[PDB]
Structures are given as structure tokens and as C-alpha cells.
Structure 1
Amino acid sequence: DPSDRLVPELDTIVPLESTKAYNMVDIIHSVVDEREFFEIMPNYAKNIIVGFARMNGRTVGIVGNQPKVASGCLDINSSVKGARFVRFCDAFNIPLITFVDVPGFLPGTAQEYGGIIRHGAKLLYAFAEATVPKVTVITRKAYGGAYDVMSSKHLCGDTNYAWPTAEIAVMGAKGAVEIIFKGHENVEAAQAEYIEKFANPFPAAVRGFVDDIIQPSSTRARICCDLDVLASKKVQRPWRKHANIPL
């Protein structure tokens, strides 16, 4: 499979309006070599996909969110499933590719009583500790602390890309407006200002949190080249016997 192969089918894979979902497995198949993908835990924690694939003949670990199941939210099972795979891939010198489409963590009293904080910290630790090269592509959205849990640029990430339909925000637009403009008594002009000011990849691109805004059709050729230059990545960290993962 040629490294510079284009994928025009991904230019409209993400629906233009938010409430509709799509299949991230389609994107994963379109991006990787020969559309071959060995999925790990395909029937458990369906809201996240982890697996092994190849880019330009080199094995890579693929981690992504699933908007089809649970609207892409993160929970205990998905956090553990992603964390173990990320830890293994980092331990055995396997590059990581991440596809981010997450609205946050799944709410409810069942998640709080189960220790959702511990498992979210597990996933965040797994992504933060990783030394192997990491490439991240934000497809549709990344809201709140989940955006940090999904290997953001500030977790010593190597390369971050955002599709033109992406948006990075602190929280939902309606919630942010109602929590910031309580004393203004405006829900129409302020809502429009927020929608066409911060519901877009431009705040992050201006802040430098994403290296570029790339057309989806060029994502594969955009990734392989990166994996060419990051093969010699080497970092140093303070000495320790072993760290204390929040298990």
C-alpha cells in the first residue's frame, strides 16, 4: 500500500450536524495499510476501539473513540481497555495513533460508585507515560478533561492534527453560556457569539495546541511521513524503580 495514497472517502465521513453518529472503524480501515486491522476486545467496551494495524509496513497501535456506542463517551471499561493496550504498546516500542471524538465522560451514579475517577486516571496515566511516538487526529470533538485524557499536545505528544469539522472546547456551548452569562440575561446574541467564536478548531490552532488543520483525504499521507521522522525519538525521564499507577 503506497504511503502517499489518498483517501477522498473520508472528506464527508463525519456528518455536518452534531447529533448524528458515524463509524470510526471505517476511518481506521481507510487509513491503515491494505485496510487490515486486528481488533482487540471487539465485543467489550464498544465505545472505544483498540487494535493493531500497519502503516507503510510498520506495526502501529490504533486507539479511537466510537460515536456509535454511548455517543463516544468514556467509562470504566473503556478506560481500562484503552489503558492496558496503550501501556503494552509503549512498553514494546509500538507507535500509537489516536482518533479523538469524545463529548466527555459518561455520567450517572453507577459510574461514580464504581470508581470512574480511578479508571480515567488510569487512561490519562497510560497516555501521559508513553514514550513511543504518538500521532493524534481530532475528528469531530474533544470536550473537557477527556480532551486531555486522549493524548493532547501537552502530554508530551509528538504530532496533533484536527479535521476541519473538529472543535475543542472546555464544555458544551449551552452549558458554558449558561454558566458564564448568568448576569447578562442574554441567551440569543451571546449564544451566537459563542457558537461562531469558540465552536471551531481556531482557538486551539491559534494557541498552537494542534500543529495543522488538515483535509481528511490527506490524513494517511499526513501520518506515514510523521512516522518516518519519529522513528528515532528518544526522551529522558527522572530515575525511579517504578511509578505508582492509580490502579
Structure 2
Amino acid sequence: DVSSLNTVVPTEVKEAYDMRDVIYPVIDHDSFFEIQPQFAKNIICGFARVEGRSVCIIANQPKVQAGVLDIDSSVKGARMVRFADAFNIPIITFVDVPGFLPGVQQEYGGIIRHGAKLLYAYAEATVPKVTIITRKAYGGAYDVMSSKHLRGDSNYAWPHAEIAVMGAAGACKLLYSKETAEQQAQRIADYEKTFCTPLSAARKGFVDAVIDPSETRMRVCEDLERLARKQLQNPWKKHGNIPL
């Protein structure tokens, strides 16, 4: 029984929590081996067992820097995904991202190159993938973190998730150029209510089902047992050309 997952996510959207409180219940007891624990702490990677078989874990962490993707996190996740796929190891991901880290230093350091590595690693992979969206996923970060369109096997969401193009403020600004002042109060709330919810993404067909947080272990074990014998192949190549 794992019913403690019903309370992990706070009811406020600006409060933080530890993603390990979600990672630990799903996997078997005392079976986590973190990789690079002190580098780019906003992302967690490592190995773990699910029902006696080794899997790969990649999850964001809103504890550190609001769980925002970056250069170092991109490199770390890309290397982990590439190694895991090279040797036929299943991948399980937990998604909570508001976007990319904004700053001049980032563009002066080549965010465009580095952020593409994680996307390349996720798209090229052919091992079974399972994705769980806990709270939010915005912009290109939703695309990068193993979205359903990148040949993902099964995708799940929690009842309080949010999947939108961007934050409510920017959408309200772009959708009403010089609309009457005070438009903030009666437009941002309405837009967040109507489109910052998993109902629209479920209507489009981007998440398989909306599940109670207490069924995650059951669903993951079922899917990982069923997907044991998937055979997928990429077109013939001498090798790829990854953005170095």
C-alpha cells in the first residue's frame, strides 16, 4: 500500500517539495543508487529496482531552483539516457518543470546546443518508457522530458497537473494587446482555470489517463511487465550526428 502519495503535492502552487518523497514509495525498499549526487542538484538520476528488475530513474526536483532545466542538468540527463538505452534498461521519468533558466550567461554559454542533447537522447531511445506528470509542464520543457509524441509508451498525469504553452500572465498579455486596464484580475484567473489543467491535454490525447496518486506503483509494475518484449528499430545509419 502506498497512500502517502495523495498528500505529497501541496495545495499551494508556490510551495516546494522533495521529489524523493515521490521516488522512494514507487521503487523497492532501499534500492536507489544516485549518480552524481552533488552536481546539478535540480535533476536526479540513478538506478533502482521495480519488482526485482533494474530500471533507470530521471526526475526533476522543485526543491532546487524551482526544478528548472539548465546546461549541466541537460548534459547529466543526456548521458544517463544514452547509457541506459545502449544496454536495454527501462526508463521511468517524473516531470515537474516551469521552463528553462533565463539569463545572458546561458546564451553566452550555448544553451541551444546543450538543451538539445537531452531531447536527442529521449527521441533516439527505443527502450520502454514510462512518464508521470505530477504538477506542471510548460513550453519546450514539456516536449523535452519524454513527451508522448516522442514514441513514448505510456504517459500518466496526476489530478492537479497543469500542461500549458506558458504561464498565465504571458498568455493573457499576448492574447490582449491594449485591452482595458485591470484586465489582470478577471482574465488571468479565468485562463488558468480553463486551460491550466490536464483536461485539455487529456481531450487532445496526450496523456493516457488521469490517475489517483495511490495507483502509481500498480500502474508502473503492470506497464513494465507488459512492455518486456518490445522490438523497435531506427532507420539504417552508420551512426547519428548528436549536437556536441
The SS at the match of 1:243 is coil
> How much does 1:195 deviate?
1.5
Whole-angstrom distance in 2 between the partners of 1:72 and 1:35: 25
SS of structure 2 residue aligned to 1:78:
helix
Letter in 2 for 1:220: R
The DSSP-based 3-state class of the residue aligned with 2:73 is helix
Q: Could you tell me which amino acid in structure 2 is paired with residue 209 of structure 1? A: F
Q: Distance in 2 between matches of 1:93 and 1:240?
A: 19
Q: Which residue of 1 aligns with 2:47?
A: 52
Deviation at 1:35, TM superposition (A): 4.2
1:65 matched to 2:60? The reply is yes
1:98-247 superposed matches below 5 A: 98-185=93-180, 186-247=183-244
After TM superposition, the score normalised by the length of structure 1 is 0.96
**TM-score of the pair, normalised by structure 2:** 0.97
Q: Report the AA paired with residue 206 of structure 1.
A: R
CA distance in 1, matches of 2:76, 2:128: 20
- Deviation readout 1:32-82 (Å, 9 max, x if unpaired): 011421100110000000010011111100000010001000110000000
2:126/2:233 contact within 8 Å kept = no
Q: 1:14 maps to what in 2? A: 9
Could you tell me how far 1:166 is from its partner in structure 2?
0.9
1:182, 1:220 → 2: CA distance? 46
Partner of 2:29: 34
Q: Secondary structure at the match of 2:184?
A: coil
Letter in 2 for 1:121: A
> What's the offset of the Cα at 1:117?
1.1
Deviations 1:167-223 (A, max 9, x none): 001001111111112243333322232011011111111111000011111101110
Between 216-225 and 174-183, report the one with greater CA deviation.
174-183
Percent identical residues: 66
Please report how far the alpha carbon of residue 110 of structure 1 lies from its aligned counterpart in structure 2 after TM superposition: 1.0
Amino acid at match of 1:174: A
CA distance in 1, matches of 2:37, 2:21: 14
Equivalent position SS for 1:43: coil
User: Aligned pair count?
Assistant: 242
For 2:33 and 2:173, how far apart are their aligned partners in 1?
44
Question: Which 4+ runs in 1 deviate beyond 3 A?
Answer: none
Query: Which one-letter code corresponds to 1:212 in the other structure?
Result: A
Alignment partner of 1:34: what SS?
Answer: coil
**How far did residue 229 of structure 1 move?**
1.0
Q: Distance in 2 between matches of 1:175 and 1:12?
A: 30
> What letter is aligned with 1:147?
Y
Native 8 Å contact 2:159 2:211 kept in 1 = yes
Instruction: Tell me, yes or no, if the aligned pair for 2:154 and 2:208 is still in contact at 8 Å.
Output: yes
- DSSP 3-state at the match of 2:29: helix
CA distance in 1, matches of 2:30, 2:134: 19
Residue deviations 1:133-181 (CA, integer Å, cap 9, x gap): 0000001100100001100000000010001121001001111111112
